[PDB]
């Protein structure tokens, strides 16, 4: 399975940024750079996982275009698998946590508009969260001092349905612990009921409504 | 001149570094530059710096001296690129502009100047500390800039577009006859 593997590759980080001139700048929690720092030590693993498999990879040549990973054998290139890194910190570890998951309005409505394939091609929809505890440049001699953004990471491998949630900000996802994520306890029954609360959300606004409202 | 001290004080990234020493080869990063530099300089002036909240809301640093919150000043980091050759983009038109209470920190009226950073640079495995030689840049040549916004403003966004210019910014060259006709167009 590419995805056991795969989980199992992520199973087993930065002090800042650094310079031609090897000047390191530490970057300590401020705003969205970790995202993009995360999805950068994840492209090598997707991708030699993804080899010893006979899967091609692929990313949106058009930037902003979802998913972040389109993997698919060439043989029955139809089915695609769509991985997306999502990543959120904690202040205390142990509490529960959240993830954002992608928009609604867009491609789950659509089928087309910013997606780099055809909705309808992509049997499996990934996600792989980071949950990190969150806590004048410096020499490459400096590395064990660097005022570093978090002490600690974790991560998970989950299919996007299964830790969905019901409400907006852009797709929440649930709120739960660690646990839960890896566990795969969600609220949604099957991702046909989580294609159908996301798609009608203009009635209901969380799930024990909606499912009074398939009535 | 805290505008002056700024400009002053105002580039060369070339990968991120684990703490196993490796480094991996790489819009935020220019965000990133300009805060340290930016909280220096109005720490030297008596001005708090504030941050936002949420997602899309100017500016991206609101200064001020807590005893005038009615003088505060917008900043925000611009960066775009080119190799040398023909413009940024400015916020929105249809917001805190026409509204002042709306996605904005504080009422648009508290705001005395606006300014905007601007970094034009020029687009193009792990490795470790010997490797940092052959490490591909990201970016060839970076230049900066401080200018306000109405002054470097004009046609329409295709956000709310700047002029198309030759980094003409620093000299101000926009089409705008004051910031009285900046708002009044946009309004």
């Given at each position: 399975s590419l995805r056991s593997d795969l989980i199992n590759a992520l199973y087993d980080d930065v002090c800042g940024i650094i310079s031609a001139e090897g000047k390191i700048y530490p970057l300590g929690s401020?705003?969205?750079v970790l995202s993009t720092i995360f999805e950068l030590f994840s492209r090598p693993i997707i991708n030699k996982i993804a080899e010893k498999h006979g899967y091609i990879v692929e990313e949106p040549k058009q930037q902003?275009?979802?998913?972040?990973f389109t993997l698919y054998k060439p043989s029955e290139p139809n089915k695609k698998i769509a991985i997306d890194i999502k990543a959120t910190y904690t202040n205390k570890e142990n509490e529960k946590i959240k993830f954002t998951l992608g928009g609604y309005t867009s491609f789950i409505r659509n089928?087309?508009?910013?997606?780099?394939?055809?909705?309808?091609?992509?049997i499996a929809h990934w996600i792989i969260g980071y949950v990190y505890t969150r806590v004048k440049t410096y020499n490459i001699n400096e590395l064990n001092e660097i005022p570093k953004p978090y002490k600690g990471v974790k991560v998970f491998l989950q299919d996007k349905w299964v830790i969905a949630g019901d409400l907006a900000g852009n797709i929440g996802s649930i709120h739960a612990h660690y646990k839960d994520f890896v566990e795969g306890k969600g609220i949604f029954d099957s991702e046909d009921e989580f294609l159908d609360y996301w798609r009608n959300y203009e009635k209901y606004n969380n799930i024990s409504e909606y499912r009074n409202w398939i009535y």
């Open positions: 401020d705003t969205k902003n275009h979802y998913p972040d089928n087309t508009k910013n997606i780099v394939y055809p909705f309808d091609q992509y």
